[PDB]
Amino acid sequence: HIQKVAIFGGTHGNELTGVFLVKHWLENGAEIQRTGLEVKPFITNPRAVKKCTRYIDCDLNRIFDLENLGKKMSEDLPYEVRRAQEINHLFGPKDSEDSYDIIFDLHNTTSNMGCTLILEDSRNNFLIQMFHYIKTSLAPLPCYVYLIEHPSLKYATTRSIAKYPVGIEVGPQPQGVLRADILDQMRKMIKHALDFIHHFNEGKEFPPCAIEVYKIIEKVDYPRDENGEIAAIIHPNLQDQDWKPLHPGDPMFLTLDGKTIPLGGDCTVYPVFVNEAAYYEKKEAFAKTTKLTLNAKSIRC
Amino acid sequence: HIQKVAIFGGTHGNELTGVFLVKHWLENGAEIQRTGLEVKPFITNPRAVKKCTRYIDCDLNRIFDLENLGKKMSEDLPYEVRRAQEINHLFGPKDSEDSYDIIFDLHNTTSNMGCTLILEDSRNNFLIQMFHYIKTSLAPLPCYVYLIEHPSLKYATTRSIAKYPVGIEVGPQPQGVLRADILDQMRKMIKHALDFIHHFNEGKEFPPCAIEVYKIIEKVDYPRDENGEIAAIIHPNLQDQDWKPLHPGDPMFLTLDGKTIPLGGDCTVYPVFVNEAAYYEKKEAFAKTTKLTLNAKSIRC
Ligand SMILES: CP(=O)(O)N[C@@H](CC(=O)O)C(=O)O
Ligand SMILES: CP(=O)(O)N[C@@H](CC(=O)O)C(=O)O
Ligand SMILES: [Zn+2]
Ligand SMILES: [Zn+2]
Numbered sequence: 175h176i177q178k179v180a181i182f183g184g185t186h187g188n189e190l191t192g193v194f195l196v197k198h199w200l201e202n203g204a205e206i207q208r209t210g211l212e213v214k215p216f217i218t219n220p221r222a223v224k225k226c227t228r229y230i231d232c233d234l235n236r237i238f239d240l241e242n243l244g245k246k247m248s249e250d251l252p253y254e255v256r257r258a259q260e261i262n263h264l265f266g267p268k269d270s271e272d273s274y275d276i277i278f279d280l281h282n283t284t285s286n287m288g289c290t291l292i293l294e295d296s297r298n299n300f301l302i303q304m305f306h307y308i309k310t311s312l313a314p315l316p317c318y319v320y321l322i323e324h325p326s327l328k329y330a331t332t333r334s335i336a337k338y339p340v341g342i343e344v345g346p347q348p349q350g351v352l353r354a355d356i357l358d359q360m361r362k363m364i365k366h367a368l369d370f371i372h373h374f375n376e377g378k379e380f381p382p383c384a385i386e387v388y389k390i391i392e393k394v395d396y397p398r399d400e401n402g403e404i405a406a407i408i409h410p411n412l413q414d415q416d417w418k419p420l421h422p423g424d425p426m427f428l429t430l431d432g433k434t435i436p437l438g439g440d441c442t443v444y445p446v447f448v449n450e451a452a453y454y455e456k457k458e459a460f461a462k463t464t465k466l467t468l469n470a471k472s473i474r475c
Numbered sequence: 476h477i478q479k480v481a482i483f484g485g486t487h488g489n490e491l492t493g494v495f496l497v498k499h500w501l502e503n504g505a506e507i508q509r510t511g512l513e514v515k516p517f518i519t520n521p522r523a524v525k526k527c528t529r530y531i532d533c534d535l536n537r538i539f540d541l542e543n544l545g546k547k548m549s550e551d552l553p554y555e556v557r558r559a560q561e562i563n564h565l566f567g568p569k570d571s572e573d574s575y576d577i578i579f580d581l582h583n584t585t586s587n588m589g590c591t592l593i594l595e596d597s598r599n600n601f602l603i604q605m606f607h608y609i610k611t612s613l614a615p616l617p618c619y620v621y622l623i624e625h626p627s628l629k630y631a632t633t634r635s636i637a638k639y640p641v642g643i644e645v646g647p648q649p650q651g652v653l654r655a656d657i658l659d660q661m662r663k664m665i666k667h668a669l670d671f672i673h674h675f676n677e678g679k680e681f682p683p684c685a686i687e688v689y690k691i692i693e694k695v696d697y698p699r700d701e702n703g704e705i706a707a708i709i710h711p712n713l714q715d716q717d718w719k720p721l722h723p724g725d726p727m728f729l730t731l732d733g734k735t736i737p738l739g740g741d742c743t744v745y746p747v748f749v750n751e752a753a754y755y756e757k758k759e760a761f762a763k764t765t766k767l768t769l770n771a772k773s774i775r776c
Contacts, residue, residue: 194705198731226755284649348585348649350752354711354729403498410655428655430499451651454527 175475176371178274179213180265181206181364185235185279185332186452187222188349191360192280206364208372218261218279218332221253226350228452229254235279238268239330266335276340278367279333280360283345284451286414289317289359292341293387294334296323301338302470304370306383311366315359318417319387320446320463327390340367346414349451377475384470388417388444388463395457397427397435406435408449408459416448416460427459476776477639477672479575481515481566482507482665486536486580486633487753488523489650492661493581507665509673519562519633522554527651529753530555536580539569540631559633567636578637579668581661584646585752587715590618590660593642594688595632597624601639603771605671607684612667616660619718620688621747621764628691641668647715650752681774689718689745689764696758698728698736707736709750709760717749717761728760 183196199206199215206213222229231252237243242255243262266273283290289312291305309317320343322328333339344360347353374380397406406427412420420426421442427435437443443462447453450460482500484493500507500516507514518524520535532553538544543556544563567574584591590613592606610618621644623629634640643664648657675681698706707728713721721727722743728736738744744763748754751761 194708194731197704284652346649348647348752349651350755351585351750352705352708353750354708354714357708357731358711404495404653407495407653407655407658410659413655430495430658449652449654451649454651 176211176275176375179211179276179278179368179371180274180336181213181215181278181280182218182332183215183280184220184223185218186228186233186281187219187224188226188228189280189282189347190226190350190352191282191344191347191357193217193223194352194357195280195361195364205361206368208368211368211372211375213368216265219254219257221257228349231255234258235331236329238262238332238334243268261332262335268335274336276338276371277333277336278340278342278364279331280364281341281343282347282349282356283343283447284348285345285416285447285449287318287343287345287416287447289315289363290341290343290345291317291319291363292343293319293321294328294331294339294341296321296387296389296468298338299470299473301340302385302468303380303383303473304338304340304367306385306470307370307380308363308366309385311369312362315362317363319385320461321387321389324390327393342367374473374475380470380473382470382472385468387466387468388446389466390446390461391443391464392462393458394426394460394462396454396459397429404454405429409434412445412448412460414448416446417444419443420445477576477676478513480512480577480579480672481517481575481637482579482581483517483519483633484581485518485520485524487534487582488520488526488528488530490529490581490583491651491653492583492645492648492658494518494524495653495658496581496661496665506662507669509669512669512673512676514669517566520555520558522558529650532556535559536632537630539563539633539635544569562633563636569636575637577639577641577672578634579641579643579665580632580634582642582644583648583650583657584644584748585649586646586717586748586750588619588644588646588717588747590616590664591642591644591646592618592620592664593644594620594622595624595629595635595640595642597622597688597690597769599639600771600774602641603686603769604681604684604774605639605641605668607686607771608671608674609664609667610686612670613663616663618664620686622688622690622769625691628694643668675774675776678775683773684771685768686771687766688769689747690767691762692744692765693763694757694759695761695763697760705755706730707734710735713746713749713761715749717747718745720744721746 183192409425484497710726
C-alpha cells in the first residue's frame with residue numbers, strides 16, 4: 175500500500191520543465207493531489223537552478239551511493255555531495271523502510287526521444303504495471319521505456335532513494351529553454367502516473383501484462399583526435415532517430431571531409447540518447463540498446 | 476581591393492558549429508581560400524570554448540566599444556574585456572583603415588531561424604550586395620536578413636572591428652550540440668560569401684538589387700513574477716515560428732493554467748529569436764521586427 179510520494183524537479187538545473195512544474199506545484203498542489211494521497215513536490219538542486227547550470231561541483235544524479243552518502247558532513251565537501259545526504263535524510267534513507275515509496279525524477283533531453291520512462295529493475299512487477307498503464311494511456315502519443323541493468327553501467331540516481339524509482343524524461347528540448355509542447359507532454363505523463371497509484375490504492379486489480387523495453391548494452395563515444403577532440407559527428411541519418419533500429423551496415427558518424435563511419439559488429443541495435451548535450455562531457459555519443467519483452471505478474475493492493 | 480578577411484568562431488563558447496569549422500580550418504584551410512585571397516580562421520573566446528560555456532565573465536560579443544576597448548590593460552579586468560583588446564589589436568583597430576576588411580562571425584541559436592545574416596548598416600551597399608548574392612545562391616533554401624540598426628539597441632560586436640562586419644547565424648540547434656544538418660548549412664553560407672568576394676575582386680559588375688530585411692523595433696520580456704520569475708511561456712502557435720507574421724489578436728504567451736496572453740498594439744510584427752536560451756538572462760522572450768526592403772546601388776572593383 176502506497177503512502178509517501180514525491181516528485182523531484184531540477185536535479186539538473188538547466189532542465190527547466192521540471193523546475194517550472196515543481197516551482198508552480200510548491201504554490202498550488204491541486205493538479206498532483208489525489209483523494210487520500212499526498213505527493214510532495216521538491217527541488218533537488220537549488221543552487222544549480224539559480225545559476226541555470228547542470229550542476230555546481232559534480233553531477234547530482236550519479237552520486238546516491240555508499241561512497242558519497244556515507245561521508246562525514248563537512249563544508250569542504252562538493253556542494254552536490256552535501257546536498258545528496260540532505261536529500262537522502264529527508265526522503266530516505268536509501269535501502270531502508272522509512273524511505274519514500276515512490277519518487278518521480280523529472281528530466282529533459284536534447285535527444286529526440288519523446289516521452290520516456292526510465293526503469294531501474296527488470297524484475298519489479300509494480301513498476302512494469304505502472305509503465306504499462308502510462309504507455310497505454312498516452313497512446314497514440316509514443317512513449318518508450320529505457321532499462322538500466324548492467325552490472326557495471328547502472329548509476330546511483332536521486333530517485334533510487336525510494337522503493338519504487340521512476341525516471342520521467344521528455345525531449346527534444348535544448349537546455350535552459352521552456353517549450354510548451356514538452357511541458358504538456360511531461361504533465362500528461364505525471365497525470366497518468368498519479369492516476370495509476372490512485373487506482374492501486376483504491377484496490378483495483380491488474381491482470382498480467384507485457385511491455386516492450388530497451389536494454390542498455392553499451393555506450394559509444396565519438397571518434398576522437400590524438401588530443402581527444404571530436405573527429406566525427408552524428409551522421410544526418412542517425413540524428414533524431416532515437417529508438418529506431420540501426421543495422422550493421424548503417425551510417426553512424428560523418429567527418430568534415432565527408433567520410434561516413436558505419437556501425438559494424440554482429441547485430442541490430444537501437445540507439446538511445448542520440449546526441450545529448452550533457453553527454454559530450456561524459457564521452458557518450460549514444461547508447462546501444464537491445465529490444466526485449468518484460469512480463470508482469472498480476473497485482474493487488 | 477578586399478585583401479584582409481577573417482572568420483571568427485567561438486565568440487560564444489557553447490556554440491559549436493563555428494568552433495568545429497574554425498578548428499578544422501586552422502589545420503586545413505583549403506575550403507576557405509580563394510585564388511588571390513588570404514582568409515584567417517580564429518577562435519575568439521578560447522577559454523569559453525575550453526569550458527564549453529557562453530562566456531567567462533561577460534558576453535564577448537557586446538563589449539567592442541570605446542568604454543571597454545580603451546581602458547588600461549590590467550589583470551583586475553574581466554577575461555572578456557582583456558580578450559577584446561587583443562582581438563582589436565590583432566584584427567582591428569576598430570574604425571581605422573588598417574583594420575580587416577571583412578570579418579565573418581559564426582553563431583548558433585536555439586531559435587528556429589534557419590540561415591540568417593545579420594546586417595549592421597542599412598546604407599551599406601557592399602554588404603547588401605553580398606547578402607543578395609548569398610540569398611540567391613542558397614535558393615530554394617530560405618535565408619533571412621536581420622537588421623540590428625538602432626538608435627539605442629545596437630551592441631558592439633566582435634565583427635564590428637571590420638569595415639564590413641557579417642554575422643552568420645544558424646538554428647535551431649541546442650547549445651553544446653553539434654548537428655550535421657546545421658554544419659552543412661553554415662558551410663554553404665560561407666562558400667557563397669567567399670565566392671562573392673572572389674567575383675568582386677575579379678572585377679565582376681554587380682547590378683542594383685533589393686533585399687527584404689527585418690528591422691529590430693522592440694525586445695519583449697516574458698511576463699515576470701512578484702519575485703521576477705517567468706510566469707508564462709511562449710505559446711505553441713508562436714514557438715518555432717520565427718519570421719512568420721504575428722497579428723495583434725494573436726497568441727503570444729501561455730500560463731500553466733493556461734490563460735492565453737495575446738499580442739496587443741495596433742499593427743503586425745515579425746518575431747525573431749523566439750525562445751533563444753542565451754537571452755532568458757538578457758530578459759528577452761523574442762524581438763519584434765518590421766519587414767522592409769533595402770536597395771543597393773550597383774558596385775564594382
Ligand atoms: C539528459 P538527463 O540528465 O536528463 N539524463 C539523466 C538520465 C536519467 O534521468 O536517468 C542523467 O544522466 O542523470
Ligand atoms: C544567440 P547569439 O549568441 O547568436 N546572439 C548574438 C547575436 C549576433 O550575432 O549579433 C549576440 O548576442 O551576440
Ligand atoms: Zn536531467
Ligand atoms: Zn553566439
